[PDB]
Amino acid sequence: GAVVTGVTAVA
Amino acid sequence: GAVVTGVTAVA
Amino acid sequence: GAVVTGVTAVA
Amino acid sequence: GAVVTGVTAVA
Amino acid sequence: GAVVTGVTAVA
Amino acid sequence: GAVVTGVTAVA
Amino acid sequence: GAVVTGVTAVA
Amino acid sequence: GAVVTGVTAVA
Amino acid sequence: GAVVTGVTAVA
């Protein structure tokens, strides 16, 4: 099917 | 300061 | 300061 | 200060 | 101060 | 079926 | 089915 | 099916 | 400061 990964960061 | 926005989707 | 918004969805 | 909003959904 | 809002749903 | 997990935090 | 995980944080 | 993961952060 | 926006999607 589908594997959707999102990361938005200020580290 | 900081404005951090993240969207992860299967629409 | 900080405004952090996250959305994770299957619509 | 801080405004943190999170949404996780299957709609 | 702080405004923290979380929503987890299957609608 | 479905496994939906949401975490919103200021730690 | 579906495995949806969301994390929104200020740590 | 689907595996959707989202991370929004200020660490 | 900083304005960080991320979008990850299968539409």
Next chain:
Amino acid sequence: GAVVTGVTAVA
């Protein structure tokens, strides 16, 4: 199917 990964960051 599909494997979609997105990273947006200020580290």
